[PDB]
Write an enzyme that holds these catalytic residues in place. Structure first.
Site, mmCIF file in Angstrom:
data_model
loop_
_atom_site.group_PDB
_atom_site.id
_atom_site.type_symbol
_atom_site.label_atom_id
_atom_site.label_comp_id
_atom_site.label_asym_id
_atom_site.label_seq_id
_atom_site.Cartn_x
_atom_site.Cartn_y
_atom_site.Cartn_z
ATOM 1 N N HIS A 41 0.781 -1.196 0.000
ATOM 2 C CA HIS A 41 0.000 0.000 0.000
ATOM 3 C C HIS A 41 0.839 1.284 0.000
ATOM 4 C CE1 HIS A 41 0.172 0.993 4.272
ATOM 5 N NE2 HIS A 41 -0.291 -0.189 4.610
ATOM 6 N N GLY A 143 2.460 5.181 10.679
ATOM 7 C CA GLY A 143 3.890 5.092 10.355
ATOM 8 C C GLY A 143 4.497 3.750 10.710
ATOM 9 N N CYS A 145 3.385 0.790 9.766
ATOM 10 C CA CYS A 145 3.323 -0.255 8.707
ATOM 11 C C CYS A 145 4.704 -0.760 8.340
ATOM 12 C CB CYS A 145 2.595 0.302 7.490
ATOM 13 S SG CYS A 145 0.854 0.575 7.786
HETATM 14 C C1 SDJ Z 1 0.528 2.428 8.240
HETATM 15 O O1 SDJ Z 1 1.572 2.825 8.693
HETATM 16 C C2 SDJ Z 1 -0.783 2.438 9.033
HETATM 17 C C3 SDJ Z 1 -0.675 1.514 10.228
HETATM 18 C C4 SDJ Z 1 -1.366 1.936 11.483
HETATM 19 C C5 SDJ Z 1 -2.049 3.089 11.745
HETATM 20 N N1 SDJ Z 1 -2.471 3.038 13.021
HETATM 21 C C6 SDJ Z 1 -2.053 1.882 13.535
HETATM 22 N N2 SDJ Z 1 -1.384 1.211 12.598
HETATM 23 N N3 SDJ Z 1 -1.930 2.027 8.216
HETATM 24 C C7 SDJ Z 1 -2.127 2.988 7.153
HETATM 25 C C8 SDJ Z 1 -3.598 3.163 6.835
HETATM 26 C C9 SDJ Z 1 -4.283 1.870 6.371
HETATM 27 C C10 SDJ Z 1 -3.997 1.436 4.947
HETATM 28 C C11 SDJ Z 1 -4.935 0.290 4.559
HETATM 29 C C12 SDJ Z 1 -4.723 -0.127 3.120
HETATM 30 C C13 SDJ Z 1 -4.737 1.037 2.126
HETATM 31 C C14 SDJ Z 1 -3.875 2.193 2.596
HETATM 32 C C15 SDJ Z 1 -4.229 2.590 4.021
HETATM 33 C C16 SDJ Z 1 -3.417 3.806 4.422
HETATM 34 N N4 SDJ Z 1 -3.692 4.207 5.803
HETATM 35 C C17 SDJ Z 1 -3.981 5.457 6.194
HETATM 36 O O2 SDJ Z 1 -4.271 5.743 7.333
HETATM 37 C C18 SDJ Z 1 -3.987 6.507 5.102
HETATM 38 C C19 SDJ Z 1 -4.039 7.949 5.584
HETATM 39 N N5 SDJ Z 1 -3.896 8.903 4.498
HETATM 40 C C20 SDJ Z 1 -2.950 8.798 3.534
HETATM 41 C C21 SDJ Z 1 -3.194 9.333 2.291
HETATM 42 C C22 SDJ Z 1 -2.258 9.237 1.279
HETATM 43 C C23 SDJ Z 1 -1.071 8.575 1.495
HETATM 44 C C24 SDJ Z 1 -0.789 8.019 2.736
HETATM 45 C C25 SDJ Z 1 -1.734 8.140 3.761
#
Ligand code: SDJ
Length: 300
Positions: A41, A143, A145
C-alpha cells in the site's frame, strides 16, 4: 520467580529494519539478503487507497519510484515485484546482518514478538497473540506499517507477521511474509469488521499453571470434571473448546505441578462461574490468554 510478558531479544530483527519511501509515504521494510519486503500500500495515493487496482498501480512504477534507506545509507533499488500484499524490492547490497531466518504462518492462539518501528527505526518490542478471529491486539500508530512479528528458535528468526492496518475497533491486521493476510481482510481503506473473538482456553490453563509455579494457589480446589462437561461451560463463556491434543500439550506443566489437567479445568470452571471475589492471579483480575504453554515453560 515472577512471570512477565516477555518478548524475544530483538537485535537480530533490528539489524534488518529499513525505511521505504514512495512519493510522500514513508513506512518500514524488512531487508533480508538482497531483498526488502514492505506493505504494497506504500504505492497508493489518498484516492487510490479507496479502491486500489494494485497491478495497475505497480506497472506504472519503476525502480526509482522507491527510496530505501538503511540508517543514513541509501540502498539502490534494482528490481521490484508484487508478492501478494507485499512488495519485494531487490537492492544492490546484501544485508550483512541477515540472520538465519524463515517465514512461518502463525496459527490462532500462538504468540510472537512485535518490533514496532517508525521511519525505519525500531521503537519498542512487545509480545502479541494471534487472536482466534485473525486480528492482533497491538499497539501501533500511523507510520508503523512494515513492523514485523517474529519468534526465535535457537539461532533462527521465524518471521510471521508484517503490519498493514488498524481496524475501526482499534485492533490490528496484517500479513505473513508471503503477503497473505491473516483473516478476511483486504488492503483497502474501507471499514472492515473481524469475526467475533473467543478466549484461548489452552493459554488460560497454561497461565494458571504459571500462577501455581509462582505460588498463587487460592483458586485450586478438589472439584474435578470430564473434558466434555468442562467444554459445555467453556462454550457458555465464549471459550474455545479444549481438545485431547490440548490436554496432552499441558502434560509437562501438569507433571511439574502435581495438578492433573482436568482438575485445573475444574479450577477454571469455578473461576468462570463465580469470578475471583476481589483477588488476583499473577497480579491480574482478568483470565490471561496470551501466554502459550511454551511461553510458560520457557519462562518458568
Ligand atoms: C501504516 O503505517 C498504518 C498503520 C497503522 C495506523 N495506526 C495503527 N497502525 N496504516 C495505514 C492506513 C491503512 C492502509 C490500509 C490499506 C490502504 C492504505 C491505508 C493507508 N492508511 C492510512 O491511514 C492513510 C491515511 N492517508 C494517507 C493518504 C495518502 C497517502 C498516505 C496516507
Amino acid at each position: 520467580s515472577g512471570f512477565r510478558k516477555m518478548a524475544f531479544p530483538s537485535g537480530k530483527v533490528e539489524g534488518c529494519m529499513v525505511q521505504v519511501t514512495c512519493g510522500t509515504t514513508t513506512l518500514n521494510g524488512l531487508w533480508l539478503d538482497d531483498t526488502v519486503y514492505c506493505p504494497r500500500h506504500v504505492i497508493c495515493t489518498a484516492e487510490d487507497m479507496l479502491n486500489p487496482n494494485y497491478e495497475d498501480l505497480l506497472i506504472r512504477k519503476s525502480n526509482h519510484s522507491f527510496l530505501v534507506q538503511a540508517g543514513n545509507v541509501q540502498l539502490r533499488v534494482i528490481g521490484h515485484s508484487m508478492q501478494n500484499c507485499l512488495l519485494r524490492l531487490k537492492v544492490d547490497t546484501s544485508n550483512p546482518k541477515t540472520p538465519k531466518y524463515k517465514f512461518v504462518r502463525i496459527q490462532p492462539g500462538q504468540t510472537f514478538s512485535v518490533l514496532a518501528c517508525y521511519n525505519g527505526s525500531p521503537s519498542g518490542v512487545y509480545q502479541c497473540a494471534m487472536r482466534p478471529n485473525h486480528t492482533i491486539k497491538g499497539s501501533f500508530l500511523n507510520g508503523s506499517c512494515g513492523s514485523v512479528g517474529f519468534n526465535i528458535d535457537y539461532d533462527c528468526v521465524s518471521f510471521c507477521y508484517m503490519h498493514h492496518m488498524e481496524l475501526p475497533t482499534g485492533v490490528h491486521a496484517g500479513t505473513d511474509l508471503e503477503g497473505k493476510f491473516y483473516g478476511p481482510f483486504v488492503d483497502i481503506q474501507t471499514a472492515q469488521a473481524a469475526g467475533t473473538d473467543t478466549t484461548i482456553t489452552l493459554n488460560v490453563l497454561a497461565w494458571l499453571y504459571a500462577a501455581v509455579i509462582n505460588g498463587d494457589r487460592w483458586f485450586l480446589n478438589r472439584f474435578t470434571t470430564t473434558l466434555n462437561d468442562f467444554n459445555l461451560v467453556a462454550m457458555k463463556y465464549n471459550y474455545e473448546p479444549l481438545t485431547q491434543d490440548h490436554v496432552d500439550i499441558l502434560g509437562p506443566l501438569s507433571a511439574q505441578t502435581g495438578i492433573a489437567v482436568l482438575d485445573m479445568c475444574a479450577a477454571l470452571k469455578e473461576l468462570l462461574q463465580n469470578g475471583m471475589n476481589g483477588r488476583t492471579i499473577l497480579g491480574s483480575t482478568i483470565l490471561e490468554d496470551e501466554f502459550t504453554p511454551f511461553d510458560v515453560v520457557r519462562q518458568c
